[PDB]
């Protein structure tokens, strides 16, 4: 059975001051000589800005996971009590954001930071 | 290393002129020499200059010569921008296009009856002090920046047209109580009229208006510019 | 003299297998052999000295673990013997704080294994699991209810919310989370159920900041016409002192410096407490620690000038602990959209490189005093996403990638979290940097009906509620597992309650003393405050 041999990590709305041009950028699927340069103009990007935006994305992901809501198992109603054992009906709460998704995202951040030379992002991970 | 003060003093007592300043440490150089506060100075910060560790003489010579012989064009452009934007000479920068938009929009709102919510040294709008508090709706509306896309796989034996769309944001802006996530429609209409007159002026042979309209979207995205709102 | 192991084996074996001890390994025999080699002489004819040295070995080794095996460490106990023939205080952050759960039905604190020590942690081990946010409010309610029940006055009995369904026209006493329901009315939440409240005729106990999210004792009459509990009075639960709080669990080593507890067993100690108290009673004036104001900025020249003026005064007489608190950058750091000027991260790195230069001319302070740094509201990690607004409370320390010169210039620097705990010989200190006055004033709940009283109410409320952040998840999101670090249980002796919106004060109440440092700079004056561990304060300023 065929699968996709690569994951995806996309940074939305990266701006090129030399063009005022807005587009996304895929750090995993896009080939080199295009991550470091604008699509239209062939002007090199600044690397610390890329690394800072990656750190921003990772921190926003962590905060978004930590601020998630709880959903019941059988019925998909939202938890509306600050403290309760479980749903009035049968079923236990589960989070909207699963753990495995963010674990895999952190793994792909590790892979991306290891492929290129990104010391600041490595130190960002190491502080956790 | 002490001759900078001597040169500045001799220039001060030899002529009353404007000074072009270009360095990554503008504030540090302003603080090192006390005579710099006594003259009108225009700053032209183009930082992030480095050395190739070898054969630096010709590259630095090229930098200096192009700077000195393009300062005329630079000051001509600055004069054009200042005499169009009703802003003094020393308060403008070549790349600081957002500042002009901010000041003119604030002036238009001041002639109106809407509070500016102006802010300094902080990339948040002024809401009376409430903005520093964490809130769920705000934190959700800052971080939802993903743009969806459509992809339908398959093999096509028919002809396919690859087209490109440009100036979508400006068209979206120009074209088109109960809801709490709504932005004040008064400001939206004000900026729509502003952009309409901007477009009309840029049509009638105005490079400055065209460049400013081009930079409008980058101003909208960038939170570093003042008068920003998520 | 190089010995033969066979002719030494019985001497060790008898003493360490028949009278006391057991299970001597081969490395233990080698360590004892080299010990005999050091204390060589008229041995194999000398009785008392060797056996009493073995008894001293037992008196050194029986306290460690259980002492039923002797590995390569035999040289380590030998060195312990050699060296047995200020210190004793530690500073701990919220990340490494020991984890202790709570159980209501047995009424004991329960140790929980640390995920850092037993788990792998190679990729992601800091992420709490789902049920922690379910159990955090349960734990807070359990602790509050136990504290209320232990009170002398309450031996009247409170009733659960759910048991209010069938009766009416009767008065009751209850307590629970006072908050807003989905509809928009004020309600009380209990592990059993919830009801609607009435405020139109409520007479409060003055001196308390009634904010949503704080446990409150409610008295009133239930009515079954609707679901309205007509309240007649509201009062925060009272407090308790450190000694009575401790004695219920003996003297637990929660902030254990002498010893630690684990899943296998629980520990206790009170014999050394009076020894350490008497040790503290002498040479305490020499062991002084000084703290400064908040929001000290490393970008403007005036703050650097004031800091230089302070350091030239402090160099001659270096204190023990110097605590730097507040935000070190006046502008929050975030994504930079300009590649023409200096990036925010590079500027943040540059702000600390100047401090390394300024510390080069104060070698006495650098050599004799340790440094403590505490993050503020808009440091690198927080303002990265919150953009200078309030956010998660257990803040990470200053990243190591931006302090690569301070650790080499100074021999003792420590970066801690926003809530940090230091354990002296007989003192424990908590430092908490954030704003409270505005937070309580703006969200104060209204009741239909000279600056020293505001801080009085603040202290009374924060000590009665017994939690650092008496707010719901909507206002201040909290990490799911680290909430135990914010719990105000076995309350500390002294609180460094730094606040930029409250005047400086030195209040003490209910066995706890609270100090409120202000901003480092104010009305063209610079102020920093030093606290003597003998319950004496001093305030000094330099223009
Ligand atoms: Zn470009
Ligand atoms: Zn259900």
Curated annotation (Swiss-Prot), chain A:
The subcellular localization recorded is: Nucleus
Q: Where are the zinc fingers (CysA-type)?
A: 16-41
Q: Where is this motif: CysB motif?
A: 72-89
User: Binding of [4Fe-4S] cluster: at which residues?
Assistant: 72, 75, 87, 89
Question: Residues that bind Zn(2+), according to the entry?
Answer: 16, 19, 38, 41
Task: Please give the family membership noted in the entry.
Answer: Belongs to the DNA polymerase type-B family.
Q: What is known of its domains?
A: The DNA polymerase activity domain resides in the N-terminal half of the protein, while the C-terminus is necessary for complexing subunits B and C. The CysA-type zinc finger is required for PCNA-binding.
What this chain does, per the entry, is described as: Catalytic component of the DNA polymerase epsilon complex which participates in chromosomal DNA replication. Required during synthesis of the leading DNA strands at the replication fork, binds at/or near replication origins and moves along DNA with the replication fork. Has 3'-5' proofreading exonuclease activity that corrects errors arising during DNA replication.
Reproduce the miscellaneous comment text.
In eukaryotes there are five DNA polymerases: alpha, beta, gamma, delta, and epsilon which are responsible for different reactions of DNA synthesis.
Subunit and partners: DNA polymerase epsilon is a heterotetramer consisting of POL2, DPB2, DPB3 and DPB4.
Give the protein name, as stated in the record: DNA polymerase epsilon catalytic subunit A
In terms of the whole protein, what range is present? 2093 to 2220 of 2222
UniProtKB/Swiss-Prot annotation, chain C:
Q: Which residues carry this modification: Phosphoserine?
A: 469
Q: Which domain of life is it from?
A: Eukaryota
**What are the GO cellular component annotations?**
cytoplasm; epsilon DNA polymerase complex; nuclear replication fork; nucleus
- The answer to keyword Cell cycle applying to this record is yes
Q: Name one GO biological process term.
A: DNA-templated DNA replication maintenance of fidelity
Q: Where is the signal peptide?
A: none
Q: From the Swiss-Prot or TrEMBL record, what is one GO molecular function term?
A: DNA binding
Is Signal given among the entry's keywords?
no
Modifications after synthesis and translation = Phosphorylated in a cell cycle dependent manner during late G1 phase. Phosphorylation may facilitate the interaction with POL2 or the activity of DNA polymerase II. Phosphorylation is independent of DNA replication but dependent upon CDC28 in vivo.
InterPro entries, per the entry: DNA_pol_a/d/e_bsu, POLE2
Q: What is its main location?
A: cytoplasm
Q: Where in the cell is it found?
A: Cytoplasm; Nucleus
The alphabetical list of record keywords is: Cell cycle, Cytoplasm, DNA replication, DNA-binding, Nucleus, Phosphoprotein
Share what the entry says about its subunit structure, partners included. Answer: DNA polymerase epsilon is a heterotetramer consisting of POL2, DPB2, DPB3 and DPB4.
Describe its function: As accessory component of the DNA polymerase epsilon complex participates in chromosomal DNA replication. It is required during synthesis of the leading and lagging DNA strands at the replication fork and binds at/or near replication origins and moves along DNA with the replication fork. It has 3'-5' proofreading exonuclease activity that correct errors arising during DNA replication. It is also involved in DNA synthesis during DNA repair.
Family per similarity comment:
Belongs to the DNA polymerase epsilon subunit B family.
Q: What else is known?
A: Present with 3110 +/- 251 molecules/cell in log phase SD medium. In eukaryotes there are five DNA polymerases: alpha, beta, gamma, delta, and epsilon which are responsible for different reactions of DNA synthesis.
> In its UniProt entry, what is this protein called?
DNA polymerase epsilon subunit B
Q: Which organism is it from?
A: Saccharomyces cerevisiae (strain ATCC 204508 / S288c) (Baker's yeast)
């Amino acid at each position: 059975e065929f699968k996709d041999p690569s994951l995806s990590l996309v940074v939305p709305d990266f701006l090129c001051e030399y063009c005022f041009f807005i587009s996304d950028i895929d750090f995993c699927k896009a080939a080199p000589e295009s991550i470091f340069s604008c699509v239209r103009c062939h002007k090199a990007f600044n690397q610390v800005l890329l690394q800072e935006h990656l750190i921003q994305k990772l921190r926003s992901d962590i905060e978004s996971y930590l601020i998630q809501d709880l959903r019941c198992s059988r019925c998909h109603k939202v938890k509306r009590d600050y403290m309760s054992a479980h749903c009035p009906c049968a079923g236990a709460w589960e989070g909207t954001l699963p753990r495995e998704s963010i674990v895999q995202k952190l793994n792909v951040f590790k892979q991306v930071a290891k492929y290129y030379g990104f010391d600041i992002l490595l130190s960002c991970i190491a502080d956790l | 290393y002490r001759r900078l003060s001597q040169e500045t003093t001799k220039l001060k007592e030899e002529r009353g002129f404007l000074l072009l300043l270009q360095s990554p440490f503008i504030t540090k150089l302003l603080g090192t020499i006390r005579l710099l506060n006594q003259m009108p100075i225009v700053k032209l910060s183009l930082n992030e200059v480095l050395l190739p560790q070898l054969n630096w003489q010709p590259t630095l010579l090229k930098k200096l010569v192009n700077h000195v012989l393009s300062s005329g064009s630079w000051i001509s452009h600055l004069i054009k921008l200042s005499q169009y934007s009703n802003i003094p000479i020393c308060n403008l920068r070549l790349d600081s296009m957002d500042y002009i938009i901010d000041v003119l929009y604030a002036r238009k709102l001041k002639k109106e009856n809407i509070v500016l919510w102006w802010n300094e040294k902080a990339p948040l709008p002024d809401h009376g002090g409430i903005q520093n508090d964490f809130d769920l709706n705000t934190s959700w509306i800052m971080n939802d920046s993903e743009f969806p896309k459509i992809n339908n796989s398959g093999v096509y034996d028919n002809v396919v047209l690859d087209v490109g769309v440009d100036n979508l944001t400006v068209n979206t802006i120009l074209t088109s109580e109960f809801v709490h996530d709504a932005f004040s429609n008064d400001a939206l209409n004000v900026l729509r009229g502003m952009l309409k007159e901007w477009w009309d002026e840029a049509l009638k042979e105005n490079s400055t208006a065209d460049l400013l309209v081009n930079s409008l979207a980058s101003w909208v995205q960038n939170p570093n510019a003042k008068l920003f709102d998520g | 003299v190089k010995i033969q192991p066979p002719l030494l084996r019985p001497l060790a074996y008898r003493v360490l297998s028949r009278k006391y001890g057991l299970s001597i390994k081969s490395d233990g025999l080698s360590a004892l052999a080299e010990f005999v080699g050091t204390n060589i002489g008229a041995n194999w004819r000398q009785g008392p000295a060797t056996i009493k040295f073995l008894e001293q070995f037992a008196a050194v080794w029986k306290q460690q673990e259980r002492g039923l095996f002797i590995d390569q460490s035999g040289v380590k106990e030998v060195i312990q013997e050699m060296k047995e023939r200020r210190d004793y205080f530690k500073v701990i952050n919220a990340s490494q704080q020991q984890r202790f759960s709570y159980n209501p039905h047995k009424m004991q604190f329960i140790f929980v294994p640390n995920k850092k020590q037993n788990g792998l942690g190679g990729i992601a081990g800091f992420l709490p699991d789902i049920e922690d946010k379910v159990q955090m409010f349960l734990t807070r309610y359990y602790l509050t209810n136990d504290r209320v029940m232990r009170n002398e006055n309450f031996q009247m009995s409170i009733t659960p919310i759910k048991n209010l369904l069938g009766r009416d026209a009767q008065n009751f006493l209850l307590l629970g989370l006072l908050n807003k329901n989905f509809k928009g009315n004020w309600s009380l939440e209990d592990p059993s159920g919830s009801v609607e409240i009435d405020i139109s005729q409520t007479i409060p106990t003055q001196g308390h900041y009634y904010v949503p999210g704080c446990m409150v004792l409610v008295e009133g009459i239930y009515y079954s016409v609707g679901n309205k509990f007509h309240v007649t009075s509201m009062t925060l639960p009272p407090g308790e002192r450190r000694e009575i709080t401790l004695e219920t669990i003996g003297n637990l080593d929660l902030l254990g410096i002498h010893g630690i507890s684990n899943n296998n067993f629980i520990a206790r100690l009170d014999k050394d407490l009076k020894i350490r108290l008497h040790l503290l009673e002498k040479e305490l004036t020499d062991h002084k620690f000084v703290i400064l104001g908040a929001n000290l900025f490393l970008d403007d020249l005036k703050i650097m000038t004031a800091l230089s003026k302070i350091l030239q005064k402090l160099n001659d007489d270096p204190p023990t602990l110097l605590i730097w608190q507040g935000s070190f950058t006046s502008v929050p750091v975030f994504a930079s959209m300009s590649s023409r000027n200096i990036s925010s991260s590079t500027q943040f790195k540059n702000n600390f490189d100047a401090l390394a230069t300024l510390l080069s001319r104060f070698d006495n302070l650098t050599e004799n005093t340790t440094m403590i740094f505490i993050p503020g509201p808009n440091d690198l990690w927080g303002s990265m996403v919150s953009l200078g607004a309030s956010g998660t409370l257990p803040q990470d320390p200053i990243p190591s990638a931006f302090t690569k010169k301070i650790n080499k210039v100074c021999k003792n620097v420590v970066w801690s979290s926003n809530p940090t705990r230091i354990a002296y010989l007989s003192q424990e200190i908590v430092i908490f940097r954030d704003d409270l006055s505005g937070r309580f004033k703006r969200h104060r709940l209204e009741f239909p009906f000279q600056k020293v009283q505001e801080t009085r109410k603040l202290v009374k409320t924060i000590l009665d509620q017994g939690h650092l952040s008496p707010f719901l998840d909507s206002l201040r999101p909290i990490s799911w597992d680290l909430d135990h670090t914010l719990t105000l249980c076995p309350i500390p002796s002294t609180m460094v309650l730094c606040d930029t919106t409250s005047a400086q004060f030195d209040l003490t109440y209910n066995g706890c003393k609270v100090i409120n440092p202000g901003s480092f700079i104010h009305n063209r004056r610079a102020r920093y405050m030093e606290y003597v561990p003998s319950s004496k304060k001093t305030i000094q300023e330099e223009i």
